[PDB]
Design a protein around this ligand. Structure first.
Ligand SMILES: [Cl-]
Ligand SMILES: [Cl-]
Ligand SMILES: [Zn+2]
Ligand SMILES: [Zn+2]
Lengths: 401, 402
């Protein structure tokens, strides 16, 4: 047979036209207006958009779905604060079992792939109560999920290196077990030590030769200062391109000149950013960052836990949410959000060379039931088909792997 | 003696916080009991999930909906939104639009709404020197054909402005004579350039036909609040307490909070009602604060897939999620207030509250959801299982079966 799989009549946004896509093994081999040749399996996209797999660049798979089980979501009789949610986590992880955490990770991943997400980066709580229990469960589930979704795992010091003093050794072990990145939280308002927390993070990252993903939620000028120190140390440590800042809410309320001043530093350091659609501030300068050529991905953040009650693991839904948070309507702007859930995310994850609907790239694709990125955001139609490693894994809302 | 025309089994009801069977005869709820003895022909098992009254989309523009559709990309959206440019696109559209095209759009809009469990809506219809009464005629006609699916109130809406399009006054009078249910205008300040005159004219017309009022006030900041204050004061002077709605009211987001604090007693004294549309609700809109003060605040789609708003699925449960995200809400209490906005607050805006709710004696207009509670429905966005209007099943598993 000439192709293992052909997708017929696929509208491709980057080319602005309709094409047949021919696939062999896990690779795209041919993209032509009409493909002749024999073929084992076919999918007709019927003139609708086919897209690369969506990238959910920031999740917490380990503690997901912990709000579920009752008539009302658990934990949400009281308002959100970072420190209270940290406490709920310590209480939860005290009695949580390896199998419960694993089941949550798998459930999370299944929900993501049903919505066309084929790549994700998850953080995992590492602290003196969870120890490496969560890491173990996540790494194990990651192995079992290889044929559905690619997962990068961040060893994440949720309590703070200088607040939970067991964090440093537990993170080292976590990275020794095979976590892919390392990260901390709020060098200023959580750690009370910007220089020390950041320096420690880089030391650990260099010991295991891993990339960095840091949670910086601190608002205003203290947030921007924290990210500036991060970016400066990124350069000093020879880590250009290897560092991600997650959240960065501070760009919304810090004076705009602080961001204007910092952009060249972020470009020089190759700083990457992820904004999560469960918290992106309505005045976040998302479009401005993209127009400046800053690499900005998008993400679910927490799903149905003591941090965020919401979540469907659906990046197309997240795109709609972002348009509404940021008050966007033009085709251009909706197109930039679509980039955020696709090619920007790929770039954050470091997989851009293998990402996209181009000959030679990975056959990880989503056939949608809408005509274009803009219409898919607007109409929220369910995914028709999902393809991973050139194999069909989702058809009409069902996992068929 | 006679037996139920319809029973819904195992219905979780939010106001009672328990699971009940619901028995229906004709268009009315007759019995709500833990177990209704005996079987009937037409039954629906809710399987322990939430059953809710029909959702209220308290503000739509059915007449010009879906005009953005037809191509690979949405039409009209190569340029950013401004009120005045969208007014121009409308005048251009209505020049060549046919009675049948407008009607088809209205029906398509309504079908999309009922598929998502909306059983009551208030739509505005452009009345101006280009549309004339063509849109009104089409909407009133479609409204008659849709009675078994959805209740529609129709606002004769002077979109161009009474003092900008001078043919508006006479066209509105005929529109109301044809049977529109309410009258309204737009932006007394920045569109009409005449706050006293536009408002006084609107009340004169409203009194001539004994209809209620729904005014679009999109003007931001203190000019918006001033406009609404004048509206509320004239509401009292004209003996129209309870008969006036202010749509949008974006100005409450950016006007100083002490302006809203000062105005609240006036709004209560006038019985002013408000609608915020989830396609534009400003992120700092004091939604919770208005509700906690006992102000009546409903929710709505606004435009769907046109030259004003490209978005829209006519789905109030989706709108609820959008509002939680716009306003940064997470607590069960706050999500519960948003659910009130898409149900009982909307009913109150529309004036149907005496017949609205899952209570014995009320209208059997209901939605069976695939989620456990208002909060979980907002979060998980599951499709509607069943929709019931006038005690008859009209939607089953994403299909209109009426
Ligand atoms: Cl410091
Ligand atoms: Cl005036
Ligand atoms: Zn996070
Ligand atoms: Zn409107």
């Amino acid at each position: 047979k000439d192709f293992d799989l052909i997708i017929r009549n696929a509208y491709l946004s980057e080319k602005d036209s309709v094409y047949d896509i021919g696939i062999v093994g896990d690779r795209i081999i041919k993209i032509e207006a009409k493909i002749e040749g024999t073929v084992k399996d076919e999918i007709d996209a019927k003139g609708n958009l086919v897209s690369p797999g969506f990238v959910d660049a920031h999740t917490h798979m380990d503690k997901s779905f912990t709000s579920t089980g009752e008539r009302l979501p658990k934990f949400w009789s009281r308002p959100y604060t970072r420190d209270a949610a940290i406490e709920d986590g310590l209480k939860y992880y005290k009695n949580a079992t390896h199998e419960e955490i694993k089941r949550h990770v798998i459930e999370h991943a299944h929900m993501q792939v049903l919505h066309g997400t084929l790549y994700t980066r998850t953080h995992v709580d590492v602290d003196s109560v969870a120890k490496t229990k969560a890491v173990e469960a996540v790494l194990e589930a990651k192995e079992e999920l290889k044929d559905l979704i690619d997962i990068q795992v961040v060893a994440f010091a949720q309590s703070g290196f200088f607040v939970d003093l067991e964090s440093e050794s537990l993170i080292r072990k976590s990275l020794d077990m095979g976590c892919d990145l390392v990260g901390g939280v709020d060098p200023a308002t959580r750690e009370n030590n910007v220089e020390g927390s950041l320096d420690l993070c880089f030391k650990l990252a260099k010991e295991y030769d891993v990339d960095i993903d840091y949670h910086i939620h601190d608002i205003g000028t203290v947030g921007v200062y924290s990210i500036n120190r991060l970016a400066q140390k990124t350069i000093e440590n020879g880590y250009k391109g290897r560092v991600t800042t997650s959240a960065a809410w501070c760009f919304a309320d810090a004076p705009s000149e602080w961001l204007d001043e910092a952009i060249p530093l972020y470009k020089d350091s190759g700083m990457k950013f992820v904004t999560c659609f469960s918290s992106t501030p309505p005045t976040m300068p998302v479009i401005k960052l993209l127009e400046a050529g800053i690499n900005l991905g998008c993400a679910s953040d927490n799903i149905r836990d003591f941090w965020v009650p919401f979540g469907n693991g659906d990046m197309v839904q997240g795109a709609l949410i972002e348009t509404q948070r940021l008050e966007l309507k033009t085709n251009r702007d909706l197109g930039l959000i679509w980039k955020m859930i696709t090619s920007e995310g790929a770039r954050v994850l470091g997989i851009e060379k293998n990402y996209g609907i181009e000959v030679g790239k990975k056959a990880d694709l989503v056939v949608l039931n809408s005509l274009s990125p803009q219409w898919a955001i607007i109409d929220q139609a369910k995914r028709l088909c999902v393809i991973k490693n050139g194999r069909i894994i989702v058809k009409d809302e069902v996992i068929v792997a």
